[PDB]
Design a protein around this nucleic acid. Structure first.
Length: 155
RNA sequence: AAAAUUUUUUUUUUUUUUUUUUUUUUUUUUUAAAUUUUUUUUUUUUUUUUUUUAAAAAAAAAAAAAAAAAAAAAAAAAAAAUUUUUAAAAAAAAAAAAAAAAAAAAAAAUUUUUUUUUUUAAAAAAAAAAAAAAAAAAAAAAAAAAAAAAAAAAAAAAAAU
């Protein structure tokens, strides 16, 4: 049934109904206990993070996918959110993303370092530095984070 | 601002694959189909004549069969308001594989239609190969998942203020 669900999700995404596709996938997981393949989750995460869908509240659904996808045993996607944060991501959504991935208030230092590097590589030193205001001291006083903010300076 | 990390193990999902099995598709081998008239030329039979080589051909006559050239008629088509010309109508669209173009989303992830080419109009037996499905696993893992573990602080239970 997983291949059929994958084809159904692709058909709904191709018919401009990604918002309905997320609701259908959530209803099928909660009610009928489907276990979709990783490619379906990849397609849903990639399609929900487009510019028009994300501005209409799609980012909350794409963020809530990660606990649901984590429940089945899948690894959480890190790559597709970087492209969204490099263009129009906000710090309030960034801290929610960095806290919704795991339960111990943050992942390891490498994920936050990758977020800072991705938001620095697109000449955005405002929200990238303001996101450092919302994290505790062990990231703020870490030598690697201060080094990364000292290399890709706005100068 | 204050107070209220170290090692190792793997699980997903990978990255290729190793082997085995099944199915679809394809290739290979053998197998079901059958108009008339005049002139000229060709072939089987009979006898005679001549020539040639170690056994054949050619010349003449007769009998029988077929094809081509010319004429007439029949049939079919086009032009003008009579003339010319000579194996027949075509079940075909869908499906299958590959390539290109178009539009609308991403722009270099995962959809569509159109156009072009090939095939299907194909059945029994035999054999292998590509794709899909199922399984164990042979090697590299970020982050998630844990344990021991530099933790520390608060509470509870048990042994020797």
């Amino acid at each position: 049934a997983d291949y059929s669900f994958e084809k159904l999700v692709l058909a709904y995404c191709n018919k401009n109904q990604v918002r309905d596709a997320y609701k259908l996938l959530s209803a099928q997981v909660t009610k009928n206990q489907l276990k979709p393949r990783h490619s379906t989750y990849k397609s849903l995460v990639t399609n929900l993070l487009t510019k028009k869908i994300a501005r209409d509240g799609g980012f909350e659904e794409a963020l809530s996918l990660l606990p649901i996808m984590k429940d089945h045993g899948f690894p959480p996607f890190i790559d597709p959110f970087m492209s969204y944060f490099s263009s129009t991501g906000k710090s309030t959504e960034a801290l929610g993303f960095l806290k919704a991935m795991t339960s111990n208030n943050f992942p390891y230092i490498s994920v936050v370092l990758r977020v800072f590097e991705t938001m620095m590589k697109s000449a955005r030193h405002s929200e990238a530095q303001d996101l450092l205001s919302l994290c505790p001291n062990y990231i703020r006083n870490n030598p690697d984070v201060l080094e990364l903010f000292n290399t890709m300076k706005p100068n």
